[PDB]
């Protein structure tokens, strides 16, 4: 906000008029200051508020109504970092002098005053920048050397001998820029975090490396702010919509949404908005709140491809242009320009260049797009390749086209409408896709059917997994990636469990497979490890005949505290433990010189 007041002031309360707020048997007061300000929050205890000097950091925000909306927040002198920062900021500011000059003047007043860590600890870098520039531009006149060029080329060459590019770039500046923006105040940008982005689970690439093999590189996940991903999610939501009424609670859907025209109209209506909700969805069909619902939460809002609507709003705010500049290519280019260039000045340069290349006025477009919010850090499950492949299949109406589909999906569709037999077609396919008699029936498709049509696999069925010996387990242990769990404690516990099971299998199995028959897991915050350890250990005693299938083997039988304590008490194990641990207890009795640590019982004698 243009203000960023955050002003630290110390105000004394004059009087506390009773505000008549009787809550929980106590009436609250208000706060009045000499300047004419009131604390927004109420006051209960008057002992700490009457005629006391209270200091807060206050921010004034200009609301649309035309009056400041002052905020209040308690701060403490020399105890709060932000409070000390703001106090020093204001003390330098009202002096209208440089921070070094402020330190001087304080030294002038009191020679005993300590400077570092007490007087000025934390302030904005811009103050030091301002003072240092001022001194260099002042001294540059007197010293001819600061205006020379042979020395400025020599020093640039010394700094960047092996960098021709940076040498040539900097040969156009002055010594002030070198001292400020290239040496002292240069701060490196954040390291790229794209290296940790997850991989697409559908698209693979195969290539021959230098090691004489052929292995696969994965595709990085598409950003969730991608217009393709936004459109895909909007299409998913629009197709998933089923309506309900309030009188008889019947499924009124497929009546108001039967033909392709209604779905096309719903999509076109949702393009112009940013977030659909109950009221907008009901009004789109001229329905009402009192009579119908949309099968979901009546007070929740879902994303509605807000990027396109925001771009349209900005491109209408710039004005002085026709309503045809914005298109799919322009939207993608705008997304690339804003999301790619994550730096303020370079973002400004990119926006100016984008306004220059297109025949548009760069007067209000730059102002509209300079405050564009940086996109949220989130990435989808798949990539842009998968979404680009899948999107033609889902769309219906004029957005449904057979030409944009690639060779593989088109051939699979032709095979499934022909009814012939392919090695990639099962009876499940003909059961599910019996309604796809004609190639035109591939309208308004869903994620699962379109995914199988495109790639040829029905959802994620895992690979079950069976370990024929400890070789597989030790390979998996060697290939285990560090920091792949929530916390290090769990991962180290699991790793040591794997180590001990490997050792026991090696010893008591002597290299014989299937030596173990059943494995039981007891845990005793730590609850999430159960499913993971069951999934890991399923790969040993799984039964391959089909009588043991699923995410986890039926052989893995988790335990619980109830059965443990019941069997320990019933089977005499509690007595065994007690007699085993007694010797420490009579030693404790002997050292304590008391008999309280062991108590006799006659039921067990």
């Amino acid at each position: 906000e243009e203000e960023k007041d955050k002003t630290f002031v110390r105000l004394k309360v004059d009087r506390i008029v009773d505000s008549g707020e009787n809550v929980k048997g106590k009436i609250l007061y208000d706060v009045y200051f000499e300047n004419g300000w009131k604390y927004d929050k109420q006051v209960v205890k008057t002992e700490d508020w009457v005629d006391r000097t209270k200091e807060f950091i206050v921010s004034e925000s200009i609301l649309k109504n035309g009056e400041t909306k002052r905020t209040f927040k308690a701060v403490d002198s020399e105890k709060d970092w932000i409070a000390i920062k703001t106090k020093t900021e204001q003390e330098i500011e009202h002096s209208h002098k440089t921070v070094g000059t402020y330190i001087y003047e304080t030294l002038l007043q009191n020679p005993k005053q300590k400077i570092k860590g007490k007087l000025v600890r934390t302030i904005e870098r811009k103050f030091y920048k301002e003072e240092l520039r001022q001194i260099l531009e002042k001294q540059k006149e007197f010293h001819q050397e600061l205006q020379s060029d042979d020395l400025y080329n020599d020093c640039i060459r010394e700094l960047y001998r092996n960098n021709e590019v940076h040498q040539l770039t900097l040969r156009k500046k002055d010594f002030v820029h070198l001292f400020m923006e290239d040496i002292i105040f240069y701060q490196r940008p954040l390291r790229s975090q794209k290296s940790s982005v997850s991989n697409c689970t559908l698209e693979f690439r195969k290539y021959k490396g230098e090691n004489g093999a052929e292995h696969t590189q994965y595709l990085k996940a598409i950003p969730k702010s991608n217009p393709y991903y936004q459109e895909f999610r909007l299409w998913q939501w629009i197709f998933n919509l089923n309506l309900y009424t309030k009188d008889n609670d019947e499924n009124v859907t497929k009546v108001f949404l039967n033909t392709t025209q209604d779905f096309e109209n719903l999509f076109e209506f949702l393009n112009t908005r940013k977030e659909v909700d109950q009221k907008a969805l009901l009004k789109h069909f001229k329905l009402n709140e009192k009579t119908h619902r949309w099968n979901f939460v009546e007070d929740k809002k879902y994303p509605c491809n807000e990027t396109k609507t925001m771009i349209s709003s900005r491109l209408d705010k710039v004005e002085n242009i026709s309503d045809d500049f914005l298109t799919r290519d322009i939207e993608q280019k705008i997304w690339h320009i804003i999301y790619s260039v994550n730096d303020k000045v370079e973002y400004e340069k990119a926006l100016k260049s984008f306004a220059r290349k297109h025949h548009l006025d760069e007067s209000s477009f730059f102002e509209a797009f300079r405050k564009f919010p940086p996109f949220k850090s989130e990435y989808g499950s798949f990539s842009e390749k998968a979404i680009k492949k899948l999107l033609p299949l889902m769309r219906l109406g004029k957005y449904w086209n057979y030409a944009e589909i690639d060779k593989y999906s088109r051939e699979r569709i032709q095979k499934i409408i022909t009814g012939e037999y392919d090695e990639n077609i099962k009876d499940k396919v003909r059961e599910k896709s019996v309604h796809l008699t004609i190639e035109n029936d591939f309208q308004g498709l869903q994620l699962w059917l379109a995914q199988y049509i495109v790639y040829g696999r029905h959802s994620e069925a895992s690979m079950i997994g069976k370990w024929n010996s400890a070789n597989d387990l030790e390979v998996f242990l060697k290939d285990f990636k560090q920091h792949s769990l929530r916390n290090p404690i769990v991962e180290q516990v699991i790793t040591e469990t794997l180590r001990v099971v490997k050792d026991i299998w090696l010893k008591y199995g002597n290299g014989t497979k299937d030596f173990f028959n059943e494995i039981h897991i007891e845990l005793g915050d730590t609850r999430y490890i159960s499913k993971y350890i069951s999934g890991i250990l399923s790969n040993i005693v799984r039964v391959e005949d089909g009588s043991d299938e699923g995410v986890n083997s039926k052989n893995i039988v988790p335990g619980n505290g109830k059965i443990t304590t019941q069997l320990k008490q019933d089977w005499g194990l509690n007595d065994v433990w007690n007699d085993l641990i007694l010797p420490r207890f009579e030693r404790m009795n002997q050292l304590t010189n008391s008999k309280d640590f062991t108590a006799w019982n006659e039921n067990h004698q």
Partner: protein, 48 residues
């Protein structure tokens, strides 16, 4: 049960970041020394 920097890697990263800041400051000082020497602004004994 609650968690407050409960990891060895956390303190390792803390120490590494502190060292990195120190090394950045030292590099800035080195570049300043080189620039000032090539401009001949330092005193004789200091540059010696």
């Amino acid at each position: 049960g609650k968690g407050n920097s409960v990891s060895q890697t956390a303190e390792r990263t803390k120490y590494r970041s502190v060292r990195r800041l120190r090394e950045r400051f030292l590099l800035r000082r080195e570049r300043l020394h080189r620039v000032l020497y090539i401009l001949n602004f330092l005193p004789e004994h200091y540059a010696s």
